[PDB]
Amino acid sequence: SLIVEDAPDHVRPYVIRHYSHARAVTVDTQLYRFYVTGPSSGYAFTLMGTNAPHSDALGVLPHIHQKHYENFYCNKGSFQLWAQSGNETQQTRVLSSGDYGSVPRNVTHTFQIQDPDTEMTGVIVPGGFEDLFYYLGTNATDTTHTPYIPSTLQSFDVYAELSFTPRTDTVNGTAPANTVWHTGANALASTAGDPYFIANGWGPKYLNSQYGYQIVAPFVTATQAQDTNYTLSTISMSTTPSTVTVPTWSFPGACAFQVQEGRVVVQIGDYAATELGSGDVAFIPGGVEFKYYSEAYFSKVLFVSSGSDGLDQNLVNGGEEWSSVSFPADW
Amino acid sequence: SSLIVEDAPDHVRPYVIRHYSHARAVTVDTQLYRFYVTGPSSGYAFTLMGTNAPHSDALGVLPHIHQKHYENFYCNKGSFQLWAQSGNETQQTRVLSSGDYGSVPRNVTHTFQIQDPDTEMTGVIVPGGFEDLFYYLGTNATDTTHTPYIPTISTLQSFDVYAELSFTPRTDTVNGTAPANTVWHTGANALASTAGDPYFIANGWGPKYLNSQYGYQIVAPFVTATQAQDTNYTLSTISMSTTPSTVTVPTWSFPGACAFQVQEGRVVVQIGDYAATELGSGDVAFIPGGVEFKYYSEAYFSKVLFVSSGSDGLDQNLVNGGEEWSSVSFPADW
Ligand SMILES: *[C@@H]1O[C@H](CO)[C@@H](O[C@@H]2O[C@H](CO)[C@@H](O[C@@H]3O[C@H](CO)[C@@H](O)[C@H](O[C@H]4O[C@H](CO)[C@@H](O)[C@H](O)[C@@H]4O)[C@@H]3O)[C@H](O)[C@H]2NC(C)=O)[C@H](O)[C@H]1NC(C)=O
Ligand SMILES: *[C@@H]1O[C@H](CO)[C@@H](O[C@@H]2O[C@H](CO)[C@@H](O)[C@H](O)[C@H]2NC(C)=O)[C@H](O)[C@H]1NC(C)=O
Ligand SMILES: *[C@@H]1O[C@H](CO)[C@@H](O)[C@H](O)[C@H]1NC(C)=O
Ligand SMILES: *[C@@H]1O[C@H](CO)[C@@H](O)[C@H](O)[C@H]1NC(C)=O
Ligand SMILES: *[C@@H]1O[C@H](CO)[C@@H](O)[C@H](O)[C@H]1NC(C)=O
Ligand SMILES: *[C@@H]1O[C@H](CO)[C@@H](O)[C@H](O)[C@H]1NC(C)=O
Ligand SMILES: *[C@@H]1O[C@H](CO)[C@@H](O)[C@H](O)[C@H]1NC(C)=O
Ligand SMILES: O=c1cc(CO)occ1O
Ligand SMILES: O=c1cc(CO)occ1O
Ligand SMILES: [Cu+2]
Ligand SMILES: [Cu+2]
Numbered sequence A: 001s002l003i004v005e006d007a008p009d010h011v012r013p014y015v016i017r018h019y020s021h022a023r024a025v026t027v028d029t030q031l032y033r034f035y036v037t038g039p040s041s042g043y044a045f046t047l048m049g050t051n052a053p054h055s056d057a058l059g060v061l062p063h064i065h066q067k068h069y070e071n072f073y074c075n076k077g078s079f080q081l082w083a084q085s086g087n088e089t090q091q092t093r094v095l096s097s098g099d100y101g102s103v104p105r106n107v108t109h110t111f112q113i114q115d116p117d118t119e120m121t122g123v124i125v126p127g128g129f130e131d132l133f134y135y136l137g138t139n140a141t142d143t144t145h146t147p148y149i150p151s152t153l154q155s156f157d158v159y160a161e162l163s164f165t166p167r168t169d170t171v172n173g174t175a176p177a178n179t180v181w182h183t184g185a186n187a188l189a190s191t192a193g194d195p196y197f198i199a200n201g202w203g204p205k206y207l208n209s210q211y212g213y214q215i216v217a218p219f220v221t222a223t224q225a226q227d228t229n230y231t232l233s234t235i236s237m238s239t240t241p242s243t244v245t246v247p248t249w250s251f252p253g254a255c256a257f258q259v260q261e262g263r264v265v266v267q268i269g270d271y272a273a274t275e276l277g278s279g280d281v282a283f284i285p286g287g288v289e290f291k292y293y294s295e296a297y298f299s300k301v302l303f304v305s306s307g308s309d310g311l312d313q314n315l316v317n318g319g320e321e322w323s324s325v326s327f328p329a330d331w
Numbered sequence B: 001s002s003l004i005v006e007d008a009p010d011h012v013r014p015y016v017i018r019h020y021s022h023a024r025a026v027t028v029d030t031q032l033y034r035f036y037v038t039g040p041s042s043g044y045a046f047t048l049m050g051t052n053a054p055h056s057d058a059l060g061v062l063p064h065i066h067q068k069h070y071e072n073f074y075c076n077k078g079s080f081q082l083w084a085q086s087g088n089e090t091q092q093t094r095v096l097s098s099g100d101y102g103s104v105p106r107n108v109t110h111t112f113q114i115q116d117p118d119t120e121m122t123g124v125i126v127p128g129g130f131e132d133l134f135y136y137l138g139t140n141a142t143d144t145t146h147t148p149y150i151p152t153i154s155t156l157q158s159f160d161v162y163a164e165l166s167f168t169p170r171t172d173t174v175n176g177t178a179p180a181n182t183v184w185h186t187g188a189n190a191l192a193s194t195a196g197d198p199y200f201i202a203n204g205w206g207p208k209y210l211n212s213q214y215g216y217q218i219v220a221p222f223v224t225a226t227q228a229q230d231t232n233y234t235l236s237t238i239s240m241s242t243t244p245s246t247v248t249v250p251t252w253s254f255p256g257a258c259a260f261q262v263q264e265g266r267v268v269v270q271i272g273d274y275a276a277t278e279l280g281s282g283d284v285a286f287i288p289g290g291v292e293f294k295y296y297s298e299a300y301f302s303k304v305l306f307v308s309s310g311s312d313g314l315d316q317n318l319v320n321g322g323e324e325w326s327s328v329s330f331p332a333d334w
Helices: A131-136 A222-228 A312-315 B132-137 B155-158 B224-230 B314-321
Strands: A014-016 A026-028 A030-036 A046-052 A067-076 A079-085 A093-096 A100-103 A109-111 A117-125 A196-198 A203-208 A214-220 A230-237 A255-263 A263-267 A274-276 A280-286 A290-294 A301-305 A318-324 B015-017 B026-029 B031-037 B045-053 B072-079 B079-086 B092-099 B102-105 B108-114 B119-126 B197-202 B206-210 B217-221 B232-242 B258-266 B269-273 B277-279 B284-286 B294-296 B301-308 B324-327
Touching: A026 A131, A030 A109, A030 A255, A030 A280, A067 A079, A067 A214, A079 A100, A093 A100, A093 A196, A100 A214, A203 A312, A214 A312, A222 A230, A230 A312, A263 A280, A301 A312, B026 B132, B026 B224, B031 B284, B072 B092, B072 B217, B079 B102, B079 B119, B092 B102, B092 B197, B102 B217, B119 B301, B206 B314, B217 B314, B224 B269, B232 B314, B269 B284, B277 B284, B301 B314
Parallel strands: none
Antiparallel strands: A014 A280, A026 A030, A030 A046, A046 A117, A067 A100, A067 A117, A079 A093, A079 A109, A100 A196, A203 A214, A203 A318, A214 A230, A230 A301, A255 A280, A255 A301, A263 A274, A263 A290, B015 B284, B026 B031, B031 B045, B045 B119, B072 B102, B072 B119, B079 B092, B079 B108, B102 B197, B206 B217, B206 B324, B217 B232, B232 B301, B258 B284, B258 B301, B269 B277, B269 B294
8 A cells, every 4th residue: 555646644655656646736837746745754855746838937936945955857848947156156057857956055046947848856855845835826636637737935935036137148058158068077066055957967976786786876965965964866777686685775864766767666664565657756764674676677766865874875885986877788 | 478578579469678678789889779679570660779879979870861761760868969951951950858859751861969978769760671770780789787878882872871971960059959040949840741851849849639539648740641651650659648437448450560669657558469568668569550459558647659650550540539739738627
């Protein structure tokens, strides 16, 4: 009974399929889904999905969160993201599938949906921010499970930035001009509090060969999370050779993952093993044993963990710097 | 009887080949080719192949023409630039990203270039058998772990590859397109009405039809009779809802072979007397012409890349049974 249609109201092992109801709400043309919520994760983090059509206007007015670190991962389609810390140069990228944008506390930001089939996976730390979407949004029954329908919010940690003007000199999906976006490697900001972007496949990667091949592409480490105390990355996986036992994991902090590509089998606690496909999400409470392996010859998941030393950091630590998005051809 | 094979069969029969299966893999430099459907596996109806490769600062192939093959470029993930020219018409170029499509009819000069590290192009060539070229050009790859990719004019002409040495890929690309008076991810893309002309369809920006006969299905045509002419096939994506209360998953049969590769979601396919099988991203199913099959989506929304030999296979059938639709999403109510 691992599978649920809305995130549970208390911490427990669960899997929720892509486009499940997930307390769906709409905000104009956008449809939000809350795969993992405050209640659901013990307030460790929120993992939500936003589906939306092209829009000629910003999806939200510029604003800041003082207590929440926000992460934007493009599942598909595309959306532009703007960000600025203090008086540092304003940054903007157009994110396509697999691209990532990091938005720390106190960073002014906004976004705009570009493509007709756009999906933004949002990871917010800590959890509970979603209350704002319940409040400002309109409930959506969404019977068919269709992806989307064809200055007063300080209480909700939303602080307006009405002076902020989103730059309009974007060329080749980025601005300012002296940036690298899909044309060279990207690094995680070394300065805490600064926003940064990693184009799909262009960031640092680490190969782990302890249990078949796994490639971790870090998005947020301790360096960036500081006191928010979490890590975020993608983990690409080979199959597990028959001569390797699939390891059993346990971590103090809750963790979760959304499959982006492939077929991943997860077994959590005393629940039956379940195979996840695109956009499917698995949530594992802290201190609960879990095993996972890829049935597909190559899978890739978006992974979030509460704590400084969860699964992704563990695989990196037991691994090595790696230059490719593909793993070795030989075991 | 399991549909699953590791390489395409040397004859026609129902099968399913998993993403990144060996598929008779070969490499040409950094590029890894997989032949999910071949001439012999499809009765020469068409070829469906996967090309995985890293970024390159150089073209991935010298500009050339095919006089007897219609080429189709679909970006499964990552991105790559495609240039195409018909005769003396303006040279067109687009940077395809996930879900984008490039159509390259016969006698159209073309080349491509890999941009992102994890780029995958799904190629559909009609008719089938064109893969012989890659058997010659490529080196057999064992790829034990199934990693996506590894980290002469007389002979080419005989493979229907006619070099165009004077072709100069244009260098004025901006926002992933050139020339300037073009529409790429900023508006509607129509299928070309003139045969032999190349065209490009950005993910979700092309024409769509909503079929409500068996739940909701949205067909986004990539190639129709208009464009295929004598090559006699269709190509498109089909997006699907789950099958709702009172509705039974229907059974289909069409004279020409057909196939699909899942892009998103989870799709169950049952072909002939074989056991049903659930497919995930990149997985391919092949259905011989004249064999009965059923498919449905276990996922709340799935999207597949579909090809059919003949002018009236599944996709055209759904279009004919449906109505023009303006969204990539289906209605919220049954
Ligand atoms: C490549 O793509 C980028 C987007 O990724 C695109 O950038 C866009 O440029 C247009 C045109 O410059 C911008 O729209 C303008 O923004 C400015 C700055 O605020 C406004 O002053 C403009 O308003 C005037 O012009 C309007 C339309 O002509 C009038 O209707 C209006 O009343 C004003 O007179 C105008 O809206 C847009 O802001 C950017 N977008 C981003 C996100 O940067 C660029 O054009 C593309 N490059 C090429 C060469 O194709
Ligand atoms: C936007 O990106 C394009 C490439 O997609 C750049 O175009 C290249 O520009 C240089 C200089 O003109 C040429 O030598 C290359 O041949 C071009 N490549 C292509 C594929 O056309 C373009 O310069 C970029 N624009 C800006 C302002 O950054
Ligand atoms: C963000 O700014 C507010 C007010 O300036 C401050 O109280 C808060 O501690 C800041 N947090 C961070 C992480 O900068
Ligand atoms: C970070 O989170 C982990 C997992 O929840 C927890 O064990 C640890 O106490 C936290 N560390 C800090 C500094 O709060
Ligand atoms: C392609 O061009 C060749 C060269 O002239 C010509 O013989 C042939 O008829 C053309 N084929 C098509 C399909 O237009
Ligand atoms: C590569 O494999 C193909 C098909 O299995 C075979 O026909 C060919 O002889 C092989 N190439 C070499 C040089 O071994
Ligand atoms: C087009 O293809 C279909 C299916 O393969 C076939 O039944 C039909 O006869 C073909 N038409 C021609 C002219 O070959
Ligand atoms: O700026 C934001 C945008 C979205 C949409 O994903 O969610 C939360 C935000 O704070
Ligand atoms: O031009 C071509 C490019 C590729 C790359 O996959 O395959 C076949 C071709 O004809
Ligand atoms: Cu925000
Ligand atoms: Cu070609």
